[PDB]
Coordinates of C-alpha atoms in Angstrom, one line a residue:
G6 CA 15.6 -10.3 0.1
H7 CA 14.3 -8.0 2.8
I8 CA 11.0 -6.3 3.6
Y9 CA 11.1 -2.6 4.3
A10 CA 8.6 -0.8 6.5
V11 CA 8.5 2.9 5.6
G12 CA 6.9 5.6 7.7
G13 CA 3.4 5.2 9.1
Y14 CA 1.8 6.5 12.2
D15 CA 2.6 5.6 15.8
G16 CA -0.6 6.6 17.7
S17 CA 0.4 4.7 20.8
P18 CA 0.3 6.9 23.9
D19 CA 4.1 7.2 24.1
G20 CA 4.6 7.2 20.3
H21 CA 6.0 9.9 18.0
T22 CA 2.9 10.1 15.7
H23 CA 3.9 10.7 12.0
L24 CA 7.0 8.7 11.2
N25 CA 10.0 9.2 9.0
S26 CA 11.7 6.1 10.3
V27 CA 12.3 3.0 8.2
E28 CA 13.1 -0.6 9.3
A29 CA 14.2 -3.7 7.4
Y30 CA 13.1 -7.3 8.0
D31 CA 15.6 -10.1 7.4
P32 CA 13.6 -13.4 7.1
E33 CA 16.6 -15.5 7.9
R34 CA 17.4 -13.9 11.2
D35 CA 13.7 -13.1 11.9
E36 CA 14.8 -9.6 12.9
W37 CA 13.9 -5.9 12.2
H38 CA 16.6 -3.2 12.0
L39 CA 16.2 0.5 11.8
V40 CA 17.9 2.1 8.8
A41 CA 18.2 5.7 7.6
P42 CA 15.0 7.8 8.1
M43 CA 13.4 9.6 5.2
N44 CA 13.6 13.4 4.6
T45 CA 9.9 13.8 5.4
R46 CA 7.5 12.1 7.8
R47 CA 4.8 10.3 5.9
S48 CA 1.7 8.3 7.1
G49 CA -0.6 6.9 4.5
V50 CA 2.5 6.6 2.2
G51 CA 2.7 4.6 -1.0
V52 CA 6.0 2.6 -1.5
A53 CA 7.4 0.9 -4.6
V54 CA 10.6 -0.7 -5.7
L55 CA 12.2 0.2 -9.1
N56 CA 15.7 -0.3 -10.4
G57 CA 17.1 -1.3 -7.0
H58 CA 15.7 1.7 -5.1
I59 CA 12.7 2.1 -2.8
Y60 CA 10.4 5.0 -3.6
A61 CA 8.2 6.7 -0.9
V62 CA 5.3 8.4 -2.6
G63 CA 3.1 11.1 -1.1
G64 CA 1.5 10.6 2.3
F65 CA 0.6 12.9 5.1
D66 CA 3.1 14.9 7.3
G67 CA 1.0 15.7 10.3
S68 CA 4.1 16.7 12.4
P69 CA 4.2 19.6 14.8
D70 CA 5.2 22.2 12.1
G71 CA 3.7 20.9 8.9
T72 CA 0.2 19.4 8.6
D73 CA 0.4 18.7 4.9
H74 CA -0.8 16.2 2.3
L75 CA 2.3 15.5 0.3
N76 CA 3.1 15.6 -3.4
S77 CA 6.8 15.0 -2.7
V78 CA 8.6 11.7 -3.5
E79 CA 11.9 10.4 -2.2
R80 CA 14.1 7.5 -3.2
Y81 CA 16.1 5.1 -1.0
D82 CA 19.5 3.8 -2.0
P83 CA 20.3 0.6 0.1
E84 CA 23.9 0.6 -0.8
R85 CA 24.5 4.1 0.6
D86 CA 21.6 4.0 3.2
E87 CA 20.3 7.5 2.2
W88 CA 17.1 9.0 1.0
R89 CA 17.0 11.6 -1.8
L90 CA 14.0 13.7 -3.0
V91 CA 13.0 13.3 -6.6
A92 CA 10.5 15.0 -8.8
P93 CA 7.1 15.7 -7.1
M94 CA 3.8 14.5 -8.3
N95 CA 1.2 16.8 -9.9
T96 CA -1.2 16.2 -7.1
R97 CA -0.8 15.9 -3.3
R98 CA -2.0 12.4 -2.2
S99 CA -2.2 10.8 1.2
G100 CA -3.8 7.3 1.5
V101 CA -2.3 6.7 -2.0
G102 CA -1.7 3.4 -3.7
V103 CA 1.4 2.8 -5.8
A104 CA 2.7 0.0 -8.0
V105 CA 5.3 -0.6 -10.7
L106 CA 4.4 -1.5 -14.3
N107 CA 6.6 -1.4 -17.4
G108 CA 9.4 0.4 -15.7
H109 CA 7.2 3.2 -14.3
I110 CA 5.7 4.0 -10.9
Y111 CA 2.0 4.6 -10.8
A112 CA 0.4 6.7 -8.1
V113 CA -3.3 5.9 -7.8
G114 CA -6.0 7.8 -6.1
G115 CA -5.5 9.0 -2.6
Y116 CA -6.7 12.1 -0.7
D117 CA -5.8 15.8 -1.3
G118 CA -6.9 17.7 1.8
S119 CA -4.6 20.6 1.3
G122 CA -10.5 21.2 -1.1
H123 CA -10.9 17.9 0.7
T124 CA -10.9 15.7 -2.3
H125 CA -10.9 11.9 -2.7
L126 CA -9.1 11.4 -5.9
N127 CA -9.8 9.4 -9.0
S128 CA -6.7 10.7 -10.7
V129 CA -3.6 8.6 -11.5
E130 CA -0.1 9.5 -12.6
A131 CA 3.0 7.8 -13.9
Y132 CA 6.6 8.4 -12.9
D133 CA 9.4 7.9 -15.5
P134 CA 12.7 7.5 -13.7
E135 CA 14.8 8.1 -16.8
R136 CA 13.4 11.7 -17.2
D137 CA 12.4 12.2 -13.5
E138 CA 8.9 13.4 -14.2
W139 CA 5.3 12.6 -13.4
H140 CA 2.6 12.5 -16.0
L141 CA -1.1 12.2 -15.4
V142 CA -2.9 9.3 -17.2
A143 CA -6.5 8.2 -17.4
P144 CA -8.5 8.6 -14.1
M145 CA -10.3 5.8 -12.4
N146 CA -14.1 5.3 -12.7
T147 CA -14.4 5.8 -8.9
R148 CA -12.6 8.1 -6.4
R149 CA -10.6 6.0 -3.9
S150 CA -8.5 6.9 -0.9
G151 CA -7.0 4.2 1.3
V152 CA -6.9 2.1 -2.0
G153 CA -4.8 -1.0 -2.4
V154 CA -2.9 -1.3 -5.7
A155 CA -1.1 -4.2 -7.3
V156 CA 0.2 -5.3 -10.7
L157 CA -0.9 -8.6 -12.2
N158 CA -0.8 -9.8 -15.8
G159 CA 0.3 -6.5 -17.2
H160 CA -2.5 -4.4 -15.6
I161 CA -2.7 -2.2 -12.5
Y162 CA -5.6 -3.2 -10.1
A163 CA -7.1 -0.6 -7.8
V164 CA -8.8 -2.5 -5.0
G165 CA -11.4 -1.1 -2.6
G166 CA -10.8 2.2 -0.8
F167 CA -13.0 5.0 0.3
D168 CA -15.0 7.3 -1.9
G169 CA -16.0 10.0 0.5
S170 CA -17.3 12.4 -2.2
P171 CA -20.6 14.1 -1.5
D172 CA -22.4 11.8 -4.0
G173 CA -21.3 8.8 -2.0
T174 CA -19.5 8.4 1.3
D175 CA -18.8 4.7 0.7
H176 CA -16.3 2.1 1.7
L177 CA -15.7 0.3 -1.5
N178 CA -15.9 -3.3 -2.5
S179 CA -15.4 -2.4 -6.2
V180 CA -12.2 -3.2 -8.1
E181 CA -10.9 -1.7 -11.4
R182 CA -8.1 -2.7 -13.8
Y183 CA -5.8 -0.4 -15.8
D184 CA -4.8 -1.2 -19.3
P185 CA -1.6 0.7 -20.2
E186 CA -2.0 0.0 -23.9
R187 CA -5.3 1.8 -24.3
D188 CA -4.9 4.0 -21.2
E189 CA -8.3 2.8 -19.8
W190 CA -9.7 1.7 -16.5
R191 CA -12.4 -1.0 -16.4
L192 CA -14.3 -2.4 -13.4
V193 CA -13.9 -6.1 -12.8
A194 CA -15.5 -8.4 -10.2
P195 CA -16.0 -6.7 -6.8
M196 CA -14.7 -8.1 -3.6
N197 CA -17.0 -10.0 -1.3
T198 CA -16.3 -7.4 1.5
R199 CA -16.1 -3.6 1.4
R200 CA -12.5 -2.6 2.5
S201 CA -10.9 0.8 2.9
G202 CA -7.3 1.1 4.1
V203 CA -6.8 -2.4 2.6
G204 CA -3.4 -3.9 1.8
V205 CA -2.9 -5.8 -1.4
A206 CA -0.2 -8.0 -2.9
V207 CA 0.3 -10.5 -5.7
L208 CA 1.3 -14.1 -5.0
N209 CA 1.1 -17.2 -7.3
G210 CA -0.9 -15.3 -9.9
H211 CA -3.6 -14.0 -7.6
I212 CA -4.2 -10.7 -5.9
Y213 CA -4.7 -10.9 -2.2
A214 CA -6.8 -8.3 -0.4
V215 CA -5.8 -8.2 3.2
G216 CA -7.6 -6.6 6.1
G217 CA -8.9 -3.1 5.9
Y218 CA -12.0 -1.4 7.3
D219 CA -15.7 -1.9 6.4
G220 CA -17.4 1.2 7.6
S221 CA -20.6 0.4 5.7
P222 CA -24.0 1.3 7.3
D223 CA -24.2 -2.4 8.2
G224 CA -21.7 -2.4 11.2
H225 CA -18.4 -0.4 11.3
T226 CA -15.5 -2.9 11.7
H227 CA -11.7 -3.4 11.3
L228 CA -11.1 -6.6 9.3
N229 CA -9.0 -9.7 9.7
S230 CA -10.5 -11.4 6.7
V231 CA -8.6 -12.0 3.4
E232 CA -9.8 -12.6 -0.2
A233 CA -8.0 -13.6 -3.3
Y234 CA -8.7 -12.6 -6.9
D235 CA -8.3 -15.0 -9.9
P236 CA -7.8 -12.8 -13.0
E237 CA -8.6 -15.6 -15.4
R238 CA -12.0 -16.4 -13.9
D239 CA -12.6 -12.8 -12.7
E240 CA -13.7 -14.1 -9.2
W241 CA -12.8 -13.4 -5.6
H242 CA -12.7 -16.1 -3.0
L243 CA -12.2 -15.8 0.8
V244 CA -9.1 -17.4 2.3
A245 CA -7.9 -18.0 5.9
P246 CA -8.3 -14.9 8.1
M247 CA -5.4 -13.3 9.9
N248 CA -4.7 -13.6 13.6
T249 CA -5.3 -9.9 14.0
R250 CA -7.7 -7.4 12.6
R251 CA -5.7 -4.7 10.6
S252 CA -6.7 -1.6 8.7
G253 CA -4.0 0.7 7.2
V254 CA -1.9 -2.5 6.9
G255 CA 1.2 -2.9 4.7
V256 CA 1.5 -6.0 2.7
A257 CA 4.3 -7.6 0.7
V258 CA 5.3 -10.9 -0.8
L259 CA 8.7 -12.5 -0.1
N260 CA 9.8 -16.2 -0.7
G261 CA 6.3 -17.6 -1.4
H262 CA 4.7 -15.8 1.6
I263 CA 2.5 -12.8 2.1
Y264 CA 3.5 -10.5 5.0
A265 CA 0.9 -8.4 6.7
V266 CA 2.8 -5.6 8.5
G267 CA 1.5 -3.4 11.2
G268 CA -1.8 -1.5 10.8
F269 CA -4.5 -0.5 13.2
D270 CA -6.8 -2.7 15.3
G271 CA -10.0 -0.9 16.4
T276 CA -7.8 0.4 19.5
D277 CA -4.1 -0.3 18.9
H278 CA -1.5 0.7 16.4
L279 CA 0.3 -2.5 15.6
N280 CA 3.9 -3.6 15.5
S281 CA 3.0 -7.2 14.9
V282 CA 3.7 -8.9 11.6
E283 CA 2.1 -12.2 10.2
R284 CA 3.0 -14.3 7.3
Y285 CA 0.6 -16.3 5.1
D286 CA 1.6 -19.7 3.6
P287 CA -0.7 -20.4 0.6
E288 CA 0.1 -24.2 0.7
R289 CA -1.2 -24.6 4.3
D290 CA -3.7 -21.6 4.0
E291 CA -2.6 -20.4 7.4
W292 CA -1.2 -17.2 8.9
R293 CA 1.7 -17.3 11.4
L294 CA 3.1 -14.4 13.5
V295 CA 6.8 -13.6 13.0
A296 CA 9.1 -11.1 14.8
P297 CA 7.3 -7.7 15.5
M298 CA 8.6 -4.4 14.2
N299 CA 10.6 -2.0 16.5
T300 CA 7.9 0.7 16.0
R301 CA 4.1 0.5 15.8
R302 CA 3.0 1.8 12.4
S303 CA -0.5 2.2 11.0
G304 CA -0.8 3.6 7.4
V305 CA 2.7 2.1 6.8
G306 CA 4.2 1.5 3.4
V307 CA 6.0 -1.8 2.7
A308 CA 8.2 -3.0 -0.1
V309 CA 10.6 -5.9 -0.8
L310 CA 14.1 -5.3 -2.0

């Protein structure tokens, strides 16, 4: 398969800022190729794969004309190399987490700055009827949240609360049961992480990078932690070569890929790949474009 890097933000001094461009990584050639751009520029975008299509969910269009937090959603068809808009969400969400469970896309948390609200709300997309439905909200408001699916539950990992009753970078983690429509907190991470990337590999959730802006020492992270759902525990694993917040993460062929992000002060085009058998990160070919707040999916 291929990794897709979708949208993001190029804040490099010659960069084009909010991106609608999209590039695809081929692991066998170790090469990134630009493909069709989306209809709308999106940084802080959530990306998921469902039924052979790539969905770009929400995000922020800070382009010259529109400065909007997005409720729009568009779908990529790899065979035609075209993006088409589908039904919009109920709520505008940048910094949104997305994942796929039981044939539906879940959009989790985010930031609606159209008020300036950090969201605890969650909604579910049904591709057969092309509609979004709100479901149970999270216990905590979270923008810049990582989301992944493991053992039939959605996990919302870290993020930033930012509400007046708590401007906190989160180490907490909660799990969504679709059967009872309920969120429950589980074991927190060792490190507080907003703008964290997450993915699932060999039955564990990996929390990669992020930003710990706690009143203890504001920092972009290269550290990595893994969650064992059976024991309900988090354990640190080998750190990356580069500190990355707003990083995209995906799993392909037994490896975790950390894609782009921001090192505080560079927007990254670099890409590294984690091997769980050697517990080591290795850099692979860099992206054509630097992208922080990038969405990543595997198809």
